[PDB]
Design an enzyme around this catalytic site. Structure first.
Site, PDB file in Angstrom:
ATOM      1  N   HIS A  79     -12.594  14.031  -7.141  1.00 11.43           N
ATOM      2  CA  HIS A  79     -12.899  14.278  -8.553  1.00 11.43           C
ATOM      3  C   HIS A  79     -14.378  14.594  -8.778  1.00 11.43           C
ATOM      4  O   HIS A  79     -14.719  15.398  -9.654  1.00 11.43           O
ATOM      5  CB  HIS A  79     -12.491  13.079  -9.409  1.00 11.43           C
ATOM      6  CG  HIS A  79     -11.046  12.707  -9.274  1.00 11.43           C
ATOM      7  ND1 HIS A  79     -10.555  11.485  -9.684  1.00 11.43           N
ATOM      8  CD2 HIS A  79      -9.986  13.390  -8.771  1.00 11.43           C
ATOM      9  CE1 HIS A  79      -9.256  11.429  -9.439  1.00 11.43           C
ATOM     10  NE2 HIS A  79      -8.889  12.563  -8.869  1.00 11.43           N
ATOM     11  N   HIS A 235      -4.452  18.083 -13.732  1.00 16.61           N
ATOM     12  CA  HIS A 235      -5.172  17.211 -12.816  1.00 16.61           C
ATOM     13  C   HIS A 235      -4.994  17.654 -11.362  1.00 16.61           C
ATOM     14  O   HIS A 235      -5.934  17.559 -10.563  1.00 16.61           O
ATOM     15  CB  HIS A 235      -4.746  15.753 -12.949  1.00 16.61           C
ATOM     16  CG  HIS A 235      -5.555  14.865 -12.062  1.00 16.61           C
ATOM     17  ND1 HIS A 235      -6.808  14.418 -12.415  1.00 16.61           N
ATOM     18  CD2 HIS A 235      -5.359  14.465 -10.783  1.00 16.61           C
ATOM     19  CE1 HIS A 235      -7.319  13.720 -11.417  1.00 16.61           C
ATOM     20  NE2 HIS A 235      -6.461  13.735 -10.416  1.00 16.61           N
ATOM     21  N   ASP A 239      -7.892  18.331  -8.728  1.00 16.34           N
ATOM     22  CA  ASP A 239      -7.891  17.864  -7.340  1.00 16.34           C
ATOM     23  C   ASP A 239      -8.134  19.007  -6.361  1.00 16.34           C
ATOM     24  O   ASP A 239      -8.961  18.902  -5.446  1.00 16.34           O
ATOM     25  CB  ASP A 239      -6.550  17.194  -7.009  1.00 16.34           C
ATOM     26  CG  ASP A 239      -6.482  15.747  -7.477  1.00 16.34           C
ATOM     27  OD1 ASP A 239      -5.373  15.192  -7.530  1.00 16.34           O
ATOM     28  OD2 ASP A 239      -7.543  15.176  -7.792  1.00 16.34           O
ATOM     29  N   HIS A 262      -3.669  16.302  -1.130  1.00 19.97           N
ATOM     30  CA  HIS A 262      -4.932  16.361  -0.391  1.00 19.97           C
ATOM     31  C   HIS A 262      -4.715  16.715   1.075  1.00 19.97           C
ATOM     32  O   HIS A 262      -5.523  17.446   1.669  1.00 19.97           O
ATOM     33  CB  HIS A 262      -5.673  15.031  -0.509  1.00 19.97           C
ATOM     34  CG  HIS A 262      -5.866  14.594  -1.922  1.00 19.97           C
ATOM     35  ND1 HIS A 262      -6.596  15.328  -2.832  1.00 19.97           N
ATOM     36  CD2 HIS A 262      -5.413  13.509  -2.590  1.00 19.97           C
ATOM     37  CE1 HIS A 262      -6.593  14.706  -3.998  1.00 19.97           C
ATOM     38  NE2 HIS A 262      -5.882  13.601  -3.877  1.00 19.97           N
TER      39      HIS A 262
HETATM   40  C1  LIG Z   1       2.492  -4.523 -15.221  1.00 23.92           C
HETATM   41  O1  LIG Z   1       1.824  -4.516 -13.948  1.00 23.92           O
HETATM   42  C2  LIG Z   1       1.010  -3.356 -13.749  1.00 23.92           C
HETATM   43  N1  LIG Z   1       0.742  -2.534 -14.825  1.00 23.92           N
HETATM   44  C3  LIG Z   1       0.015  -1.477 -14.705  1.00 23.92           C
HETATM   45  C4  LIG Z   1      -0.531  -1.146 -13.423  1.00 23.92           C
HETATM   46  C5  LIG Z   1      -1.392   0.112 -13.247  1.00 23.92           C
HETATM   47  O2  LIG Z   1      -0.443   1.104 -12.957  1.00 23.92           O
HETATM   48  C6  LIG Z   1      -0.947   2.184 -12.139  1.00 23.92           C
HETATM   49  C7  LIG Z   1      -0.091   2.859 -11.303  1.00 23.92           C
HETATM   50  C8  LIG Z   1      -0.591   3.903 -10.528  1.00 23.92           C
HETATM   51  C9  LIG Z   1      -1.920   4.218 -10.620  1.00 23.92           C
HETATM   52  C10 LIG Z   1      -2.476   5.380  -9.773  1.00 23.92           C
HETATM   53  C11 LIG Z   1      -3.490   6.280 -10.384  1.00 23.92           C
HETATM   54  C12 LIG Z   1      -4.026   7.434  -9.585  1.00 23.92           C
HETATM   55  N2  LIG Z   1      -3.541   7.646  -8.178  1.00 23.92           N
HETATM   56  C13 LIG Z   1      -4.064   8.822  -7.391  1.00 23.92           C
HETATM   57  C14 LIG Z   1      -3.144  10.051  -7.843  1.00 23.92           C
HETATM   58  C15 LIG Z   1      -3.408  11.397  -7.133  1.00 23.92           C
HETATM   59  C16 LIG Z   1      -2.426  12.482  -7.719  1.00 23.92           C
HETATM   60  C17 LIG Z   1      -4.835  11.855  -7.353  1.00 23.92           C
HETATM   61  O3  LIG Z   1      -5.252  12.015  -8.468  1.00 23.92           O
HETATM   62  N3  LIG Z   1      -5.700  12.111  -6.222  1.00 23.92           N
HETATM   63  O4  LIG Z   1      -7.046  12.554  -6.426  1.00 23.92           O
HETATM   64  S1  LIG Z   1      -3.046  11.207  -5.358  1.00 23.92           S
HETATM   65  C18 LIG Z   1      -1.308  10.694  -5.143  1.00 23.92           C
HETATM   66  O5  LIG Z   1      -3.346  12.462  -4.604  1.00 23.92           O
HETATM   67  O6  LIG Z   1      -3.962  10.238  -4.704  1.00 23.92           O
HETATM   68  C19 LIG Z   1      -2.510   6.758  -7.581  1.00 23.92           C
HETATM   69  O7  LIG Z   1      -2.122   6.945  -6.450  1.00 23.92           O
HETATM   70  C20 LIG Z   1      -1.964   5.609  -8.368  1.00 23.92           C
HETATM   71  C21 LIG Z   1      -2.783   3.529 -11.480  1.00 23.92           C
HETATM   72  C22 LIG Z   1      -2.307   2.521 -12.229  1.00 23.92           C
HETATM   73  C23 LIG Z   1      -0.274  -1.943 -12.308  1.00 23.92           C
HETATM   74  C24 LIG Z   1       0.523  -3.089 -12.488  1.00 23.92           C
HETATM   75 CL1  LIG Z   1       0.893  -4.187 -11.063  1.00 23.92          CL
HETATM   76 ZN   LIG Z   2      -7.009  13.263  -8.498  1.00 23.12          ZN
END
Ligand SMILES: COc1ncc(COc2ccc(C3=CCN(CC[C@@](C)(C(=O)NO)S(C)(=O)=O)C(=O)C3)cc2)cc1Cl
Ligand SMILES: [Zn+2]
Length: 291
Positions: A79, A235, A239, A262
């Site tokens: 990012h 988004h 990326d 990625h």
């Molecule tokens: C009730 O309990 C809970 N309530 C809420 C939460 C919080 O919920 C989450 C779930 C997922 C994420 C993520 C946010 C961002 N990412 C990178 C995405 C990507 C496309 C990217 O942007 N890359 O740059 S990617 C696959 O390529 O890495 C992730 O993987 C996971 C954040 C908060 C938790 C609990 Cl326990």
């Molecule tokens: Zn990203």
């Protein structure tokens, strides 16, 4: 008039937490001389470890884009590199007090703002571009990432989530469209379906609705809503722009991703770089043909 390299005009500081590690981290952006590129630097270590933001230094790509040098990692560079690419910054040091770049609000918005508040500085050297001369593609299953000749810079992306929230394709030609306005604020996102597994692997520790679109089964959990009607695919485009900046120079050409991530983005960079007949390095002392 010649198109020149650019660095930062001033030192830039920001604080945040790693999306995946959850650790507090202090970030510092510093000017750099011509032909430095972007260089990350772990200042919590002694000696300091510098890792050039280049494809050859990419380690794992399991979650985010990661740079490695020996035992030393810099996690989640995509990012900030997207913000750097979007503002045309050629040379800069990025100092970090921990192994992961701060997630900020999940987008590139805060980085582009911090950078522009400090200002950019033109340098006495021609900016180098990598021009795509012939098509280069990599595939894995039904996923595909492609470079296509194009006199400009354009990124198109298509995602394919079978999810109610999606009921997913966008093409951005940056000769007519502002990276700052139409791409930079697109936040990263994740799914409640994955998060218990991710947390059990000590991943996404810092993620929350404060820095990501959190998608449940039957709705988005963020009470404030989406920044773009197609924020998700935008988004992915963000990326890709940061991932593609690991070439080390601005691109003249088009990227197309279909369900890419990625890992496949970096594989496309490695294939491009090895296929020397598919690209050339150009400068613009006379800017009249510049896209
Ligand atoms: C009730 O309990 C809970 N309530 C809420 C939460 C919080 O919920 C989450 C779930 C997922 C994420 C993520 C946010 C961002 N990412 C990178 C995405 C990507 C496309 C990217 O942007 N890359 O740059 S990617 C696959 O390529 O890495 C992730 O993987 C996971 C954040 C908060 C938790 C609990 Cl326990
Ligand atoms: Zn990203």
């Amino acid at each position: 008039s010649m198109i020149k390299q650019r660095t930062l005009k001033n030192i830039i500081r920001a604080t945040g937490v790693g999306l995946h590690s959850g650790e507090k981290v202090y970030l510092t952006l510093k000017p750099a001389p011509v032909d430095t590129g972007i260089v990350f630097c772990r200042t919590d270590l002694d000696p300091v470890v510098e890792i050039p933001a280049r494809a050859e230094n990419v380690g794992e790509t399991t979650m985010s884009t990661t740079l490695v040098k020996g035992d030393v990692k810099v996690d989640t560079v995509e990012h900030l590199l997207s913000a750097m690419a979007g503002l045309g910054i050629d040379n800069a040091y990025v100092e970090l007090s921990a192994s992961e770049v701060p997630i900020m609000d999940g987008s590139a918005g805060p980085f582009v703002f911090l950078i522009q508040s400090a200002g950019l500085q033109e340098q006495e050297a021609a900016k180098k571009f990598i021009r795509i001369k012939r098509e280069v593609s990599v595939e894995e299953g039904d996923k595909r990432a492609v470079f296509v000749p194009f006199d400009g810079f354009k990124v198109s992306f298509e995602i394919d989530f079978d999810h109610p929230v999606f009921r997913q394709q966008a093409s951005v030609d940056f000769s007519s469209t502002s990276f700052v306005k139409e791409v930079s604020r697109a936040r990263t996102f994740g799914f409640m379906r994955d998060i218990e597994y991710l947390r059990s692997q000590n991943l996404a520790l810092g993620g929350s609705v404060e820095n990501a679109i959190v998608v449940d089964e039957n709705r988005v959990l963020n009470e404030d809503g989406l920044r773009y009607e197609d924020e998700f695919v935008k988004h992915k485009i963000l990326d890709a722009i940061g991932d593609l900046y690991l070439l080390g120079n601005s691109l003249i050409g088009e990227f197309r991703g279909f369900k890419s991530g990625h890992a496949l983005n970096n594989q496309l960079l490695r294939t491009l770089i090895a296929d020397k007949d598919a690209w050339e390095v150009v400068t613009f002392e006379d800017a009249r043909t510049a896209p």
